[PDB]
């Protein structure tokens, strides 16, 4: 359990993926040319989880960049850290996917997927002991969503005993590109329910609200949304990236977080929310606050099956333990009683850039059903009139596949509701 292979697919996937690499490269002291210039050994101890070491003490992200059009990856390559990525790990077509899951999954994506897998295989081949994969993508478009889930299936077939983890951006009318997003997201969710072990549900609804309501951003851009995402992604991978006891690899995280295989969709949260001194008590209260959650679900509307909390910075561990106990002891009703001691806490001395201390929240809450119900309602409003379906049937799909995807997502909802009441 050491190496992770990172993949980022499509426009959203690549934009947030690029930001993730910028952020953690800074945290690990790796500059845009892959040279190390940090002042702490904590930085390099587990650097091999995410980076290969090339010649000249150069560190290279174990990262594969995928798209069905070149535009966003041209931008990535021009980006500040664009030169750090391995040039042969850019795999792209020219056709685009037109926000169409069928094109990403069955036609345009089909034609490209083998070459992605050649690169993945070359990455896995140099791994001393691959843990598994993390994928960044959105569910509302065509490439990240349709081709991204195609990839996950092929990867599982080839590495069926490795962990699959995703950061999956869920669409919202509030931050929407096309009307077919609910279709692409429902089709993708069924894939995720079956073929990932752990999925961070990143809700563009939540991201927008935080930017608007909390950060006082009148007109949030995708860039502002991605600030929150990259901050969250750094937080939730801290335990994989730095020496530590708890959830230090992807399988142990799954074992701590997933009591039933399908219910592996996590609501992440972060504090303090950023666009000059925070106390452990304040971090703890803010990390559990709905307003700090990146999935637009009311956690008081459900129950926590499991929780992982990660605190970063120099702070009193005694105080951390006290505050974490205080949260559970004073709101014990929201933690299912049939999983004793279901909240685990890690502390890492290195804080993220620009903060003295911070906290990241990963919840497996039954309230996540609210996010799937929302997608399900939007899907049905259209599907009942078969609206916009020609875009999909034109790529060889039939309606039955929509009925099935819908049924399985409603099953998922019913399954959360079951443990909410147990």
């Amino acid at each position: 359990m050491r190496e992770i292979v990172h993949i980022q697919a499509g426009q959203c996937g690549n934009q947030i993926g690029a930001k993730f690499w910028e952020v953690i490269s800074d945290e690990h002291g790796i500059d845009p040319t892959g040279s190390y210039h940090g002042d702490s050994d904590l930085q390099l101890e587990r650097i091999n989880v995410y980076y290969n070491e090339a010649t000249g003490n150069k560190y290279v992200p174990r990262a594969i960049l995928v798209d069905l059009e070149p535009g966003t990856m041209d931008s990535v390559r021009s980006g500040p850290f664009g030169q750090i990525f391995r040039p042969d790990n850019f795999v792209f077509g020219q056709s685009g996917a037109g926000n169409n899951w069928a094109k990403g999954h069955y036609t345009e994506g089909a034609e490209l997927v083998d070459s992605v897998l050649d690169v993945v295989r070359k990455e896995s081949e140099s791994c001393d002991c691959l843990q598994g994969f993390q994928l960044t993508h959105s569910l509302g478009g065509g490439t990240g969503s349709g081709m991204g889930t195609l990839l996950i299936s092929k990867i599982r077939e080839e590495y069926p005993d490795r962990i699959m983890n995703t950061f999956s951006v869920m669409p919202s009318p509030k931050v929407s590109d096309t009307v077919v997003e609910p279709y692409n997201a429902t089709l993708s969710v069924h894939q995720l329910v079956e073929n990932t072990d752990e999925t961070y549900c990143i809700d563009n609804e939540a991201l927008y609200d935080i930017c608007f309501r909390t950060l006082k951003l009148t007109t949030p851009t995708y860039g502002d949304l991605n600030h929150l995402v990259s901050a969250t992604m750094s937080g939730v991978t801290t335990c994989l990236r730095f020496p530590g006891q708890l959830n230090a690899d992807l399988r142990k995280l799954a074992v701590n977080m997933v009591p039933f295989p399908r219910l592996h969709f996590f609501m992440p949260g972060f504090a303090p929310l950023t666009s000059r001194a925070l106390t452990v008590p304040e971090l703890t209260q803010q990390m559990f606050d709905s307003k700090n959650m990146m999935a637009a679900c009311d956690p008081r509307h459900g129950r926590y099956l499991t929780v992982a909390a990660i605190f970063r910075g120099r702070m009193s561990m005694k105080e951390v333990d006290e505050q974490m106990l205080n949260v559970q002891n004073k709101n014990s009703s929201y933690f299912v009683e049939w999983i004793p001691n279901n909240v685990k806490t890690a502390v890492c001395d290195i804080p993220p850039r620009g903060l003295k201390m911070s906290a990241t929240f990963i919840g497996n809450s039954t309230a996540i059903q609210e996010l799937f119900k929302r997608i399900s309602e939007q899907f049905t409003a259209m599907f009942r009139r078969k609206a916009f379906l020609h875009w999909y049937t034109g790529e060889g799909m039939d309606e039955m596949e929509f009925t099935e995807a819908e049924s399985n997502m409603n099953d998922l909802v019913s399954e959360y509701q079951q443990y909410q009441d147990a």
């Binding site: 169409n100 929407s176 590109d177 409003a381």
Partner: protein
């Protein structure tokens, strides 16, 4: 990559083509000899303007366009006029005898004699493309060539280019400038035969453009030249996303995803603002909010109909020039708090927005004020079917007595084709009613 080939068919198609390509040249800094000093890659490139222009080694920027007409006198003006060096002669194709306002002659008798050559020349354009996206076809509904030759061509393009995208700009007839009594026949025949071969069609009602010219530009008696300059601004607005790049730019194909809920329901209503004289524009800066407001005034629509009496299935705003999202969003919020914008119950109500920062241009000697910002709204409204209703009624009046039908029958057509086309139109009007009815 992403090349678009324009095909201009018959008089209206060709003359609108003249206006659009002149405008594109001005927008991109292309001289009438085809030179473009700002373009530093000689003889090729993958710039955004390359979707519409190829380049020769000598630095000429050549429209990816074919002009076709069955008589020569309109294209002869292109051959001899200001942009004559812009086009290779083989891009401009003419017969000797026109379709005489008769769909049958355009589709069959006369059209059949030049169709293989036209496809040959289009094929030559296609072969120079590395990632052809599709075709934009410009034509009248009312002319014999615009109707019948266009239909034939669209049918042949489906065969030869499979599902490659085909979009139309279709000139819908008005009595103020129409030239044939039988235009309603030609309009129904071509709409029926083309409907399965077109992915998306922007109708331009000559009467709407005529009224806008009379009312907003104070032109006493608009000519084709007046009409065409305004049409070209609208066409330019719709194609700008293909020809320019930009952070806030949204591809026409993405708007199309939202605009077309079912294959047959593929006729967006375009609305354009601001159309204002130099005299009125001077010292009067129309704000984002003002031009957005203007999009919901029916007088500014390119097709006469009343969206306030129909239902929306999509609303898209294509901005150009000095425009930022903050101002757009605020403008839209106001409009919602004050307008008859009712959506069908099965569609989301969010407006889809794109912004191209390149400001609008005008042709020297024209009527439109040069403005800092403009907008084209593309909406999918059930109200557009009113245009089909008006046309279908005129067809019925004549067809009931079989007036003029012998002109078509004499060219080899059967009454069966008339009834078949009219029934397809009846079914289309019914389609537009059905999509507006609430879900059960």
């Amino acid at each position: 990559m992403r090349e678009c080939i324009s095909i201009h068919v018959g008089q209206a198609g060709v003359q609108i083509g003249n206006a659009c390509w002149e405008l594109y040249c001005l927008e991109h800094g292309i001289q009438p000899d085809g030179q473009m000093p700002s373009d530093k890659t000689i003889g090729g490139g993958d710039d955004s303007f390359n979707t519409f222009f190829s380049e020769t080694g000598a630095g000429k920027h050549v429209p990816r366009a074919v002009f076709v007409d069955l008589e020569p006198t309109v294209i002869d003006e292109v051959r001899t006029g200001t942009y004559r060096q812009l086009f290779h002669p083989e891009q401009l194709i003419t017969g000797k005898e026109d379709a005489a306002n008769n769909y049958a002659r355009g589709h069959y008798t006369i059209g059949k004699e030049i169709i293989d050559l036209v496809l040959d020349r289009i094929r030559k354009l296609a072969d120079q493309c590395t990632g052809l996206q599709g075709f934009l076809v410009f034509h009248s509904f009312g002319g014999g060539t615009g109707s019948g030759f266009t239909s034939l061509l669209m049918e042949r393009l489906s065969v030869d280019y499979g599902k490659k995208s085909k979009l139309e700009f279709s000139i819908y007839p008005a009595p103020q400038v129409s030239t044939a009594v039988v235009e309603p026949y030609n309009s129904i025949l071509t709409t029926h035969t083309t409907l399965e071969h077109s992915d998306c069609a922007f109708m331009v009602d000559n009467e709407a453009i005529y009224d806008i010219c009379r009312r907003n530009l104070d032109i006493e008696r608009p000519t084709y030249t007046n009409l065409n300059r305004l049409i070209s601004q609208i066409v330019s607005s719709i194609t700008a996303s293909l020809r320019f790049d930009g952070a806030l730019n949204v591809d026409l194909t993405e708007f199309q995803t939202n605009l077309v809920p079912y294959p047959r329901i593929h006729f967006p209503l375009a609305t354009y603002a601001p159309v204002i004289s130099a005299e009125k524009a001077y010292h009067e800066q129309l704000s984002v909010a003002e031009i957005t407001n203007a999009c919901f005034e029916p007088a500014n629509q390119m097709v006469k109909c009343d969206p306030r009496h129909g239902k929306y299935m999509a609303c898209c705003l294509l901005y150009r020039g000095d425009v930022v999202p903050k101002d757009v969003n605020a403008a839209i919020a106001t409009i919602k708090t004050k307008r008859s914008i009712q959506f069908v119950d099965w569609c989301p109500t969010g407006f889809k927005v794109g912004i191209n920062y390149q400001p609008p241009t005008v042709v020297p000697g024209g009527d439109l004020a040069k403005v800092q910002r403009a907008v084209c709204m593309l909406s999918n409204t059930t109200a557009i079917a009113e245009a089909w209703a008006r046309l279908d009624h005129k067809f019925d009046l004549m067809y009931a007595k079989r007036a003029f039908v012998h002109w078509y029958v004499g060219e080899g057509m059967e009454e069966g084709e008339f009834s078949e086309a009219r029934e397809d139109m009846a079914a289309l009007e019914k389609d537009y009613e059905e999509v507006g009815v609430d879900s059960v």
